[PDB]
Amino acid sequence: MVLETLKQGLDSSQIHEALIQLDSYPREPVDLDASMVLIKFVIPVYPSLPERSKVILRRLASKSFTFLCQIVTFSRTIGLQEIRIYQEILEDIISFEPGCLTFYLKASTTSKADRDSIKALFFGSKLFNVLANRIDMAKYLGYLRLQWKFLLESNETDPPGFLGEWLVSSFLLNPVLAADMLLGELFLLKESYFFSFQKIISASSLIDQKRLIAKFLLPYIQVIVTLENLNDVRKILRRFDLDKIISLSVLFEIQSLPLKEVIVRLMSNHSSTKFVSALVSKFADFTDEEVDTKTCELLVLFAVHNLNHSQREEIAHDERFLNGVTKHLGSNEREARERAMFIAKLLSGGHLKYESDFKINIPNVKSDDKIIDFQSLKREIVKRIVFLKDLMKEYEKSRKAPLIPLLKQTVKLIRQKAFQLEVGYYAQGILSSIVCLNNEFDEPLFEQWRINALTSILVVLPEKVNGAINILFNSELSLQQRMSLLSALGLSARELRGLDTQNRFRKYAGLFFYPLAHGWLNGIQLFKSHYLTTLRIIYSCANPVHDFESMTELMNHIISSAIEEGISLNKG
Numbered sequence: 165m166v167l168e169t170l171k172q173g174l175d176s177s178q179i180h181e182a183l184i185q186l187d188s189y190p191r192e193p194v195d196l197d198a199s200m201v202l203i204k205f206v207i208p209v210y211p212s213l214p215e216r217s218k219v220i221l222r223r224l225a226s227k228s229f230t231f232l233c234q235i236v237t238f239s240r241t242i243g244l245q246e247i248r249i250y251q252e253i254l255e256d257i258i259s260f261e262p263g264c265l266t267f268y269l270k271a272s273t274t275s276k277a278d279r280d281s282i283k284a285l286f287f288g289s290k291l292f293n294v295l296a297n298r299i300d301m302a303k304y305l306g307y308l309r310l311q312w313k314f315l316l317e318s319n320e321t322d323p324p325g326f327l328g329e330w331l332v333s334s335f336l337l338n339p340v341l342a343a344d345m346l347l348g349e350l351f352l353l354k355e356s357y358f359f360s361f362q363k364i365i366s367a368s369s370l371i372d373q374k375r376l377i378a379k380f381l382l383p384y385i386q387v388i389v390t391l392e393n394l395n396d397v398r399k400i401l402r403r404f405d406l407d408k409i410i411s412l413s414v415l416f417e418i419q420s421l422p423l424k425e426v427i428v429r430l431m432s433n434h435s436s437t438k439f440v441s442a443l444v445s446k447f448a449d450f451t452d453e454e455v456d457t458k459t460c461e462l463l464v465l466f467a468v469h470n471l472n473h474s475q476r477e478e479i480a481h482d483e484r485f486l487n488g489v490t491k492h493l494g495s496n497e498r499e500a501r502e503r504a505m506f507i508a509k510l511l512s513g514g515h516l517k518y519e520s521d522f523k524i525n526i527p528n529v530k531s532d533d534k535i536i537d538f539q540s541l542k543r544e545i546v547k548r549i550v551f552l553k554d555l556m557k558e559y560e561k562s563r564k565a566p567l568i569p570l571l572k573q574t575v576k577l578i579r580q581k582a583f584q585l586e587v588g589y590y591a592q593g594i595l596s597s598i599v600c601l602n603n604e605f606d607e608p609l610f611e612q613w614r615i616n617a618l619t620s621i622l623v624v625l626p627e628k629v630n631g632a633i634n635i636l637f638n639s640e641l642s643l644q645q646r647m648s649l650l651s652a653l654g655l656s657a658r659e660l661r662g663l664d665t666q667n668r669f670r671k672y673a674g675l676f677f678y679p680l681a682h683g684w685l686n687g688i689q690l691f692k693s694h695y696l697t698t699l700r701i702i703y704s705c706a707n708p709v710h711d712f713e714s715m716t717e718l719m720n721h722i723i724s725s726a727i728e729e730g731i732s733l734n735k736g
Contacts, residue, residue: 266314308345327364399534546569615655
């Protein structure tokens, strides 16, 4: 009955009363008609309603979907005030009710039409598109993760298979971010969750199986895999049917040799025989040096780990292999020649005598069925900082442990991408912070990393030199602080000049050169000598510029000044 009343009007505390009355009734759940009435007449006040009324409102979405769906399609139809209200409710729904996904799984999976509409809402993400102006993909995935975790802890067993699709769609939102949260921070947490993961992909389409394992799991494994990891990661891969899922091209992509080896050794002899064939043909048709290299080592791997003496000898007599050897000899890449001769010696005793120490270095790595140490897969916290936004938050820290990891991470991130977004702002803070760092737990090789972090910020964002050179003056740092900053300036200048291509430095020469030159002339051993030397470096690095003449004038005042003064150049 209440659904009839609201259509006409309602005091905001009368709307609350109607809702309370709705909930004392048997649940059922919201039909398309009732939700249409709810969206149009209630939601508009949502924020005004007491927390008790919001909760039963969200639960209605929790159990409908056909309701949620409507709230969504109504949002994109629709100043921005009204949509911001609807956005609110939408975010609070998936925020506070982590059940939705798993609820809809049971209720609205009776047809492919319903499943696909639910996928499009969550994972193709029509939902996220209406929330895009409010929350970002990373935050959304955060919620999505909690959505999976809830279903992962429910009593749902023997997952469907379209559930496989859904997961693929989840990863596709942002592979890298999805992998951090769904893999690193869920499916790879404990046995319980990983067991769920197996079921989900084993009870999943073959095509999807490949995506989940080859295009999402593997690359993540590659990000974390260490030598200490290796054992636990093979424990994880043996848990899947790799023989159906892994193609050469996938095996070619894998950068980690030890990982590549681990996978070669999980392949049946049937797989092995097929790949060895593929590889041999590829070896024979040898055009690309980089690709031939990857091919030869895959051969070596299989020939060594998966083939008998006789199968190895068979290849040695393959016309394909024999001809491929001849073409490698026809190479002018000495390396390519050696590669062939090596593999030929490796395969048989009757090959063509050929003395050389050249080899191909297969790893060679030497644990209980299904007892997996997920802790070892865990990723060093700092190593999973992805956004400069978060680097800076670290530099602003009762700071915990070592700094070299952070500096290492700063280089990684700033150099890889950076870009042109709101990047200038964060880089600037980060640089500022890094200059002021003291070695608090004096770790070896600090300073080097400090210089690296500084140099890389200066190289990626040259005009961040303005603030850096101002910090060298104005702010009060220690000699050392100054010395290494001065070092970064010179180092970055040289990188930008790229002679030691693309004079990426000419465009900024004067930004480095003048503040330092005046610094010298108007203000002015160990230190002055360094200053002078790094100024000399910057001066040479600016060797074409165009106002180089002006620079030269300033410069012999500085040089002549140095002479009297008695300071020395450091052949840097």
